[PDB]
């Protein structure tokens, strides 16, 4: 599984590691 960028909100760590779709 992976972290989708659609849920990253305002979190910079999430935005650095998420996958875009």
């Amino acid at each position, epitope marked *: 599984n992976f972290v989708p*960028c659609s849920i990253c909100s*305002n*979190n*910079p*760590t999430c*935005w*650095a*590691i*998420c996958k*875009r779709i």
Partner: single-chain antibody
Amino acid sequence: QVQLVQSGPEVKKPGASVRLSCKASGYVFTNYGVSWVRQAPGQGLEWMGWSSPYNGNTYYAQKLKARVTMTTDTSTNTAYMELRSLRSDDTAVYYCGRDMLGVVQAVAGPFDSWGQGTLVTVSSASGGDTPMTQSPSSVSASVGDRVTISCRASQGISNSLAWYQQKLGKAPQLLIYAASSLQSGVPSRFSGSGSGTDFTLTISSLQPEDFATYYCQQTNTFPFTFGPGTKVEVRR
């Protein structure tokens, strides 16, 4: 040695677009974020957004999201920022910066290296979820004095607080990150304290090179936001 070189100055009429470039050298480009901050003449610093050379992800400040695009080219180590639908209030020096090394690859954060800035002038046609404050806005001091500047975050930011020095006509320089960690190469007379909402920068014994404007910056959540600046002036 880390270098960011930005493209030359631009003069544009309102409604036009501009594309700026920032060439990186002296480091592994894909291990660090590249971000953009602008400064209107005589005003403070405004964070525009972040880009990852590692995976192409971006985040733009909501104020600008509709009109801005940031990209990176890892074959040429070059970052790009396009700003569209220009208006008069877009006149500013635009800086690229290297987000410092973080817990995950190329994460946004304080800038440990700055480009030299690109002036974009928009020709005349007439004539921020966590706001930050600083006190005092101006203070005068003598060489040898202790100078203490306050920063306040409108919401708790834990220790995600950086301090910068900006001398007249130059890009800012990072002094303190994580509230109290002294950046490499910065003299020990600079020290930072605080956590939560109230922070301080103190200079134990002011030196002639220390007259400058000082900015705080929260990096707890996007959009990153700067305090309005404190000018430390020579006593009249």
